[model samples]
Target chain A: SDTALIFTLAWNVKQLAFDYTPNWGRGRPSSFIDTVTFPTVLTDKAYTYRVVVSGKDLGVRPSYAVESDGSQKINFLEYNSGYGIADTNTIQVYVIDPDTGNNFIVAQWN
Target chain B: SDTALIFTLAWNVKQLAFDYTPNWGRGRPSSFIDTVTFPTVLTDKAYTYRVVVSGKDLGVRPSYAVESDGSQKINFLEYNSGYGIADTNTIQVYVIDPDTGNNFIVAQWN
Candidate 1:
């Protein structure tokens, strides 16, 4: 059960965190992720994993967009283009604000 | 190997397709997805599933962005914002061009 959280929930073992306000109709940020874990396990086996990103204004596209790094977490921003999730390793997920100097989690994965 | 292909490559059970030319430095569209599948399987077990979307312009951001439907396919377009990926079923993926009367895959989820 613990291992299940490894890849499923927002705080699993190799998990990253999300705190954006999807704030959409009938949908809230960290909503589905409140209790979801995409997992696969084997004592002595091998498996390949992939991550995909979907950018839709499901409930009316917003001026802001969610930026991702592929494995875990995301950020909501107004400037800059959206990303595609399917690459391997290292990420330029986090960034600092020029005006606020605040750090934002652009993306994170487990 | 078959099942691996199912969730590893661009073509997998409940899979989606992406054809937007990332056209970025050393990064091409369908690059990682060229052979990656995110999967989970069990003979008789249950697992809560979740999907995530990342919108980052790796090499350099572009004018048109990739739009996803979660399980199957994506599109490249302008004039709209990016989307969040973790909601429940029934997506607004495919659409028709108003000017060209042509068809386009806005989003797809397998």
Candidate 2:
């Protein structure tokens, strides 16, 4: 199964290390786009989200997802598991507490 | 608990009636912003997602979550359940089979 690897932190979000194995292989270094804006966010209470997207493809290419400024419903997000020729596309989405923190794989589709 | 009421459909996604009861009140008719784009999506197999955002306020206000153009993690998604004055934010996210279909609440927050 493919999963989204998330990092939780303190506000002001000072130092974040983007060195971890994504669902893809380690060869794919971690990279991100920052300062993505959010409208509903309380400026003082929130920090704009930083997107860390990476991938490792076997037969197909890697595709990563970015959150909408501040959104809940994840349209159709996926990560490949290299499961088969399929590269099984598994979805991942997040929900956080603003002052902020919450981490888990949301593996409960049952 | 405030929940994301999802409507599943066939991919030609021919007709979706935005006439459901949203987490928001009935007065707030369903409204959407569509033609959102996708990158990995197999164009012929994917339909541009239509976003239906609605909210309900009690002692507090309602904030809805939207999945990024095509994202996996949700930034800080929320839906205020008009339970306690806090308007407790209950979270929701989704995953579907692209051949198209898999449905249910991802309520395994344990």
Candidate 3:
């Protein structure tokens, strides 16, 4: 009986994490994300990930967008405009601020 | 009393539309969206919006991304990579499917 209860708890935790569909109504300035794909419909043939910025002073603009494999960085425009990486299990996003030259990790998926 | 009741209902409908912090947990394949901003934290200077897609035939890949005013198209890479548009109240997103030569609206914010 104890073993059965333990297994039930474990199964529910896994299911709650990824088994159901999510509804992110309207989007916000702070939301948690952990998924392999972006939102899409049956008719959509492609998806575009958006990087929105806001602040009192977010500098003049964003200088660069990129992806990293722990060692090297790839230009995000070239990567997205070209063939997407379907084989990778994880993707890391980074952006560079023009005024400060600071590279920040914007988003990631696994 | 009747006038007060009628006014209460009208006010709630408007307030419920836009005054709250939304939590889009993990995201999904199909989520309704109507907002001017993406999710971000206080430390985040930039927010990245993702448009995930899934299907048996999404064609080879996405070839292009753009913004539009309903008549003219602006290259997304150039637009996003350059100075950000902070004055606009609405932004429309579209992508081109290379294999089928079809353009589809992936996301929009207002």
Candidate 4:
């Protein structure tokens, strides 16, 4: 048994680093995504990829610690280790307020 | 110096047993709402109440643990301990799918 690779890209993210949790702790964090490219291995015959873009409004602030406008572009990629094919996937955008934790769906692409 | 009692009513919950996490672990579980009655002593002079209804479809299954259709009704009550009077609050209904964790706001009232 093997697992597939996952990738995410965050564009316009004011912060260089942040935490990413998938399935929100339903299980261990798998298919970690980083800024750089990484190899993936998969046992599943079929695979899918997904991406998301998120924006955060930190509000008026005088310091960098208090970012006023934060945004990110995330990409998720899934592929089989044994097969090579073009990755066609879904993309979604979510707008969020970090201060209030309020989020809404902005857009979706497939 | 005091706290408030919380109440919840889950009308159509197919299973009586479940867990509720508020603010999703950013903080401790406060104002817990159980099936039975409780007491409250509020330091804050103002209060509010909210209610929600949720539904779940577990797909065809043979066991109760794999319930096909499930629903719930919940209520929240907030009051002031320093002052006594009529209670006014907000009510909200949310429909959810347990398996997918997909949820939507059903309704709201004040």
The DockQ figures for the candidates are 0.01, 0.02, 0.01, 0.01
* lDDT head-to-head 2 vs 4, winner: 4
lDDT of each residue in B1-110, candidate 1, tens digit only: 12222122211111222222112111133222211112221111222222222333211122122223312222222111332323232222222323333333323332
Per-residue lDDT, model 2, residue B20, is 11
TM-scores of the candidates in the order shown: 0.15, 0.15, 0.18, 0.15
* Candidate 4 segments whose C-alpha is farther than 4 A from its true place: A1-110, B1-72, B75-87
- The DockQ value obtained for model 3 is 0.01
Residue pair clashes in candidate 2: A71-B66, A72-B65, A72-B66, A73-B67, A92-B72, A94-B74
Worst 10 residues of 4 chain A by lDDT: A1-10
Maximum-TM-score candidate: 3
Model 2 shows how many backbone clashes?
A: 6
lDDT of 3 by residue, A1-110 (tens): 12222223222321111111122221122232222221211111111233222211222222222223211123333434332333223455433433334444434433
The CAPRI classification for model 4 reads as incorrect
Candidate 2, residue B73: Cα displacement in angstroms equals 8.3
Model 3 agreement with the true structure over B1-110: per-residue lDDT tens digits: 12222123222321111111222221122242222221211111111222322211222222222223211122332334332333222445433333334434434434
Q: How accurate is candidate 4 locally (lDDT)?
A: 0.22
- Output the number of the DockQ-best candidate: 2
Candidate with better lDDT, 1 vs 2: 1
Residue A57, candidate 3: alpha-carbon lDDT? 21
* lDDT leaderboard ranking: 3, 1, 4, 2
